[PDB]
């Protein structure tokens, strides 16, 4: 938003198997004043 | 002719011929979120 990259995050235990039904707001972690275009993104994996 | 020429600074030289260190500070225009400012804080809390 307007030149700022904002990252909100939340760590929740999994009481069940996958994607529990519940509500929990995401607190803001990080704000960066980078001010450049973002249009594509990808995740990172590593092999042991 | 060689584009570069040695200064050959000497202490006995005059003020005009003496070496002088020059630093230029150039300020970037406001195109990205501002990341440089000055120290600006004072005063106490004084409650009630
Ligand atoms: C980058 O963002 C600017 C500002 O919104 C826009 O004018 C420009 O077209 C964008 N460039 C690309 C390659 O998406």
UniProtKB/Swiss-Prot annotation, chain B:
Protein name: Spike protein S1
Origin species: Severe acute respiratory syndrome coronavirus 2
Role, per record: Attaches the virion to the cell membrane by interacting with host receptor, initiating the infection. The major receptor is host ACE2. When S2/S2' has been cleaved, binding to the receptor triggers direct fusion at the cell membrane. When S2/S2' has not been cleaved, binding to the receptor results in internalization of the virus by endocytosis using host TFRC and GRM2 and leading to fusion of the virion membrane with the host endosomal membrane. Alternatively, may use NRP1/NRP2 and integrin as entry receptors.
Outcome recorded upon mutating residue 31 to P: Increased resistance to human covalescent sera neutralization
Region Disordered: start-end pairs: 31-48
Shown part of the complete sequence: 489 to 536 of 1273
Outcome of mutating residue 5 to R: In strain: Omicron/BA.1, Omicron/BA.2, Omicron/BA.2.12.1
Subunit structure: Binds to host ACE2. RBD also interacts with the N-linked glycan on 'Asn-90' of ACE2. Cleavage of S generates a polybasic C-terminal sequence on S1 that binds to host Neuropilin-1 (NRP1) and Neuropilin-2 (NRP2) receptors. Interacts with host integrin alpha-5/beta-1 (ITGA5:ITGB1) and with ACE2 in complex with integrin alpha-5/beta-1 (ITGA5:ITGB1). May interact via cytoplasmic c-terminus with M protein. May interact (via N-terminus) with host bilirubin and biliverdin, thereby preventing antibody binding to the SARS-CoV-2 spike NTD via an allosteric mechanism.
Phenotype for residue 5 to Y: Reduced host ACE2-binding affinity in vitro
């Amino acid at each position: 938003i307007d030149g700022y990259f904002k990252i909100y995050s939340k760590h929740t235990p999994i009481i069940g198997r996958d994607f529990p039904q519940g509500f929990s707001a995401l607190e803001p972690l990080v704000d960066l004043p980078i001010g450049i275009n973002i249009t594509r993104f990808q995740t990172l994996l590593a092999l042991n | 002719y060689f584009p570069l020429q040695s200064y050959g600074f000497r202490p006995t030289y005059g003020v005009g011929h003496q070496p002088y260190r020059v630093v230029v500070l150039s300020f970037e225009l406001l195109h990205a979120p501002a990341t440089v400012c000055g120290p600006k804080k004072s005063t106490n809390l004084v409650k009630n």
